[PDB]
Subunit: 124 residues, 4 copies
């Protein structure tokens, strides 16, 4: 388990804030606050992680989702982050993400942005 390691507050290269708890049976629960886009304050996130990773120095696979609706705004969109947690002095979660917006069928070719976020326990 990297339950110890994952749980807590993380920061990406944009200044976004990711607060998460890793449960014992593979759950990720928390809130996400984005520094960019059509977003204000905290959004619910849920995800999953590998609770029994390989002990061979490999990272721990995880992922989570945010739907960009809360008590402030609704951006009619959702982001999934897919990546791995890497332990050590400078712990890191390296991710790629997909951000899909609800579109009409004629616009659906342009529904989905892709990008990458690196999270550290210390802000930039």
């Amino acid at each position: 388990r990297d339950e110890a390691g994952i749980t807590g507050t993380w920061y990406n290269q944009l200044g976004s804030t990711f607060i998460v708890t890793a449960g014992a049976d593979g759950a990720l629960t928390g809130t996400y606050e984005s520094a960019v886009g059509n977003a204000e304050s905290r959004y619910v996130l849920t995800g999953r992680y590998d609770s029994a990773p390989a002990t061979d120095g490999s990272g721990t696979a995880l992922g989570w989702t945010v739907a960009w609706k809360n008590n402030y705004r609704n951006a009619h969109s959702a982001t999934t982050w897919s990546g791995q947690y890497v332990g050590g002095a400078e712990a890191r979660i390296n991710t790629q993400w997909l951000l899909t917006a609800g579109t009409t069928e004629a616009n659906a070719w342009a529904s989905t942005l892709v990008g990458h976020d690196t999270f550290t326990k210390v802000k930039p």
Copy 2:
């Protein structure tokens, strides 16, 4: 919202089976069974959807995650699907996905597959 429309069993183009409950608060919970890769039986999934979508006939944005560990197997990996639900007679969830495996730092450039899954109510 699409709570009723989304809740149920979905099948993708590979024969994979998505069983999902959409909650009133925007939650998705259920099980995923992959017909492909290093997987057997059901895996837990959790995700979110837009519980108050646009009414201009847009899709409903959603996403979910599966970590590929259950009682039977552990593939040391996780998939996320990001996409949108389109309701109607031929209801569809159109998704793109990222599958990341735990890797060493030297192999991290090769950690993440990308693909697309289209889910339908009937196989």
Copy 3:
């Protein structure tokens, strides 16, 4: 194969992909997009595996269009990465990335991803 790839292809959106595959592994031709900030034909260039596996695998390829021609400039570029699969029902199965020139501030939102399947008839 050279001649199997060479020719006119159509995707699920009604776009038109006209390509010649060189013996040197080159792809050259033109792309006409049915959607987005585009009109008329655009130059494309790419590469393909000119000596693929013989075990029934497809043939890897990729190409780029920058969305500038004599009519329009959308300050963006698409790359398609995929594989050609021969046979009665010949297909090129691709995923693509479309990056627009952005400011540094908006760079997180620079790139769309999608998937196009090309066939020999519409």
Copy 4:
């Protein structure tokens, strides 16, 4: 940006990208990968926006390598899509898709996705 893009670039893995930007929007050159099933230099071709915006935006570009040369054939191709940012920190920021030739049964796992940043300084 033709003079600015033209040159020898290195990514964070130490791969070498030698490119020439043409007047007519062409990119031509060689790529040498520090990782995967690769040896020596491979032909690349691509395109860039030869008349970009004047508003501080980057220059959109992309290129393709097929991983066949005289030394090796990985039966795969990578495309990089990104933008050139001029000036102080001269940078090409890209995302990439690496597709292998696969059987139809394995086509779900045909494509890797990643990100590479290029600078003229070898790290």
